[PDB]
Design a protein around this ligand. Structure first.
Ligand SMILES: Cc1cc2c(cc1C)N(C[C@H](O)[C@H](O)[C@H](O)COP(=O)(O)OP(=O)(O)OC[C@H]1O[C@@H](n3cnc4c(N)ncnc43)[C@H](O)[C@@H]1O)c1[nH]c(=O)[nH]c(=O)c1N2
Ligand SMILES: CCCCCNC(=N)N/N=C/c1c[nH]c2ccc(OC)cc12
Length: 368
């Protein structure tokens, strides 16, 4: 199918890099175009864990499952209330230690980058436009020379603006909002909350405000505070202004234990982000001018609160890469169609669980 042809993957996130590995290890000529300036760019966010049957199956097929295991950390979960009482402690039993250990996102990028041949990823390449030719796409990048490919795979995340050859679907806001931050040396800077986590991830919910924390993301504490988007914000917190963010959060958390307030007070900077979804519904465009598809969040971005996210994208890469290389399809288009039909099933399943969970967890009286 791909002999004497080449593949362009747009985006070097965990899904795109996994895509590249699974193609390249079957002898496919594939490049990844990534907007990040270079591989040393820090990725902001919590940890990821990979699941048996999906994310771990993609690593296994790439020969990287042990590498993931060696850099990942099994973590228990504590459920606390707003007063700081631990309502539930579930540690990881040894027989479950491979189920879904947490890995830092930069560590995961490094594993995948190290598995690829040199110069597979072309850095500082922000795709802005695609144009189909007779047999090859032309790729236009921001202030860089163009490239061509027989097959384009869109893998550049939930806010991709290069989707229109595949679908007219637009991303949507779901109505919840997320504030995220890191605390370095949390054992010094938020000792009370750090000891509350006690090596476990911690979650707590009270009157429509949700808090989730990881006390040990490669030595830092990552936490997220989520809530229904305030109506006053429709169409007011400047997240560049930590003093404005601290003031808002301290009002929201006014009846939470001081160990939670300390987290807010000592945070150096905050990142805010509306929850969004790229909804799978009616089929994507049929009879596209040249072969093109999408994987990962570009295909099915969904709320993250129940753990859906990267694993459905890693499934995409596993399925699409097998269809493109197993010699069973008469054309790249047919291989793509088969992947998309499968992804519509498990992707819709995951989106409905994520949306249902979001409705439930943000009811004003929810508790874990
Ligand atoms: C607050 C919060 C919390 C979580 C999560 C989301 C959010 C918002 N998720 C979701 C999860 O992290 C997500 O599913 C994966 O990052 C998807 O990876 P992708 O590679 O598809 O896109 P991702 O967005 O990770 O990567 C896209 C890549 O494309 C690049 N790019 C963008 N535009 C480009 C362009 N024009 N040209 C070239 N490159 C371009 C970007 O720089 C980036 O490297 C999650 N999931 C999970 O499984 N477990 C979890 O715990 C969480 N937690
Ligand atoms: C299925 C195994 C778990 C993997 C990831 N699992 C997860 N739960 N990722 N969560 C992200 C998140 C962002 N903001 C929040 C606010 C509240 C909250 O409560 C759980 C969670 C979040």
């Amino acid at each position: 199918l791909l002999s004497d042809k080449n593949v362009a993957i747009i985006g070097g996130g965990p899904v795109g890099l996994t895509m590249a590995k699974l193609l390249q290890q079957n002898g496919i000529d594939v490049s990844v175009y990534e907007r990040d300036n270079d591989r040393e760019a820090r990725i902001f966010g919590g940890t990821l864990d990979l699941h048996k049957g999906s994310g771990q199956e993609a690593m296994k097929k790439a020969g990287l499952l042990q590498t993931y295991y060696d850099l990942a950390l099994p973590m228990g979960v504590n459920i606390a209330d707003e007063k700081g009482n631990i309502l539930s402690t579930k540690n990881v039993k040894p027989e479950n230690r491979f189920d879904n250990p947490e890995i830092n996102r930069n560590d995961l990028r490094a594993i995948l980058l190290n598995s690829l041949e040199n110069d597979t990823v072309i850095w500082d390449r922000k795709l802005v436009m695609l144009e189909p030719g007779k047999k090859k796409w032309t790729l236009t990048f921001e202030n860089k020379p163009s490239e061509t490919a027989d097959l384009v795979i869109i893998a550049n995340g939930g806010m991709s603006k290069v989707r229109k050859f595949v679908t007219d679907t637009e991303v949507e806001e779901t109505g919840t909002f997320n504030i995220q931050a890191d605390i370095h040396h949390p054992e010094v800077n938020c000792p009370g909350f750090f000891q509350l986590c006690n090596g476990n991830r911690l979650m707590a919910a009270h009157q429509g405000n949700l808090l989730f924390a990881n006390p040990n993301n490669n030595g830092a504490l990552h936490f997220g505070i989520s809530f229904k988007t305030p109506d006053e914000w429709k169409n007011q917190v400047d997240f560049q202004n930590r003093n404005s963010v601290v003031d808002f959060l301290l009002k929201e958390f006014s009846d939470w234990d001081e160990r939670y307030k300390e987290l807010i007070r000592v945070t150096s900077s905050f990142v805010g982000l509306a929850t969004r979804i790229f909804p799978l519904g009616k089929s994507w465009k049929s009879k596209r001018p040249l072969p093109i598809t999408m994987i990962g969040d570009a295909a099915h971005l969904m709320p993250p609160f129940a753990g859906q996210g990267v694993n459905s994208g890693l499934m995409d890469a596993l399925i699409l890469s097998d269809n493109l290389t197993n010699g069973k399809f008469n054309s790249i288009e047919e291989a793509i169609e088969n992947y998309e039909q499968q992804m519509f099933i498990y992707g819709k399943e995951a989106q409905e669980e994520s949306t249902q969970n979001e409705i439930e967890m943000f009811k004003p009286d929810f508790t874990f």
